From Swiss-Prot:
Belongs to the calcitonin family. Amylin/IAPP is a glucoregulatory peptide hormone that plays an important role in the regulation of energy homeostasis. Selectively inhibits insulin-stimulated glucose utilization and glycogen deposition in muscle, while not affecting adipocyte glucose metabolism. IAPP function is mediated by the CALCR-RAMPs (AMYRs) receptor complexes. Amylin can also bind CALCR receptor in the absence of RAMPs, although it is more selective for AMYRs. It is found in: Secreted. It comes from the Eukaryota. The mature protein is largely unstructured in the absence of a cognate ligand, and has a strong tendency to form fibrillar aggregates. Homodimerization may be the first step of amyloid formation. This is Islet amyloid polypeptide. Amyloid fibrils are degraded by insulin-degrading enzyme IDE. The chain holds residues 53 to 62 of 89 of the full protein. The lineage of its organism: Eukaryota, Metazoa, Chordata, Craniata, Vertebrata. IAPP is the peptide subunit of amyloid found in pancreatic islets of type 2 diabetic patients and in insulinomas. Can form homodimers. Interacts with IDE and INS. Interaction with INS inhibits homodimerization and fibril formation.
Amino acid sequence: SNNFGAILSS
């Protein structure tokens, strides 16, 4: 989790 599309998924 940082600030891109990985933290918006799960």
